[PDB]
Structure 1
Amino acid sequence: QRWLGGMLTNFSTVHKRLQRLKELEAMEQTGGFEGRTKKEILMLTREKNKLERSLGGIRDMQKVPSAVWVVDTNKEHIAVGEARKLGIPVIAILDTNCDPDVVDYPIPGNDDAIRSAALLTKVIASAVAEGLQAR
């Protein structure tokens, strides 16, 4: 949904907010809501919504990636730029309007057609599942 600028490059900053989000989950699961004023209760619920909506993957990655896979690089230039800046290998779908040197292992296809996008994502997910069984 949302790509935070340099979250992979600037990981020491977002590690603190992963700590904060885990702490907030732990405190919320306890059940303490009436101990705070309703104004800050509403504020914390809103920030739960915001951060949960904008942050999905760093909850589960923690230990930083080894490869980065991107769709529609001309709009997603930020991710691939950070990937080359950090030296992480890049695998992405290049359309007719994309720079070929940006992706280390290009995969020709369409980012604009849901059929092709879903099929390519399913193929790569099947490859990942096969590797996961193969460990």
Structure 2
Amino acid sequence: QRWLGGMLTNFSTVHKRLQRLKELEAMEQTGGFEGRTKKEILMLTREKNKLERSLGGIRDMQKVPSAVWVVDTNKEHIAVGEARKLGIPVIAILDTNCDPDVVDYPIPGNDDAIRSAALLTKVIASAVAEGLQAR
């Protein structure tokens, strides 16, 4: 959805937002809604709303990733830059306008068509799948 600048280099800070997400959700799992006035009921519900849209696929993370796969080095410049500053290997599909020096494992290919996007995403996903199975 959206790369929050500092998701990698500021991990200890965004890890607190993850605690707050779990706090809010778990208070709801029991029942923190319909308890107070609409005003408050919504104020609390407007936090999960955004927090999940930006951290859903991170709730599981407990430490910065060991490797980062990127679909568009240019539109994801901040994400790539954070990874390289942490020395985390960047694997990315490079179109003709990307810079090949930022990326360690460059897979040349169209970054802009959903067909080529979905293709290479699933290729690297199957690589991860085979690694988890071979673990």
Shared fold (TM-score greater than 0.5)? yes
User: In 2 relative to 1, CA 37–87 (structure 1 residues): closer, same or farther, beyond 3 Å?
Assistant: same
**1:32 deviation in Å?**
2.8
**1:105 deviation in Å?**
0.6
Alignment of 1:1-135 (within 5 A): 1-135=1-135
Conserved? CA contact 1:95–1:109, under 8 Å: yes
SS at match of 1:102: coil
Compare 118-127 and 30-39 and name the one that shifted more. Answer: 30-39
**1:108 deviation in Å?**
0.5
- More relative contact order, 1 or 2 (CA 8 Å, 6+ apart): 2
Q: Tell me, which stretches of 5 or more residues in structure 2 are unaligned? A: none
Cα distance between partner residues in 2 of 1:132 and 1:34: 43
Matched residues, number: 135
State percent identity of aligned pairs.
100
Conserved? CA contact 1:2–1:55, under 8 Å: no
- TM-score, with length taken from structure 2: 0.95
SS at match of 1:50: helix
Conserved? CA contact 2:72–2:93, under 8 Å: yes
Cα distance between partner residues in 2 of 1:84 and 1:9: 10
Compare 30-39 and 118-127 and name the one that shifted more. Answer: 30-39
User: In 2 relative to 1, CA 111–9 (structure 1 residues): closer, same or farther, beyond 3 Å?
Assistant: same
Q: Which runs of 4+ in 1 moved over 3 A?
A: none
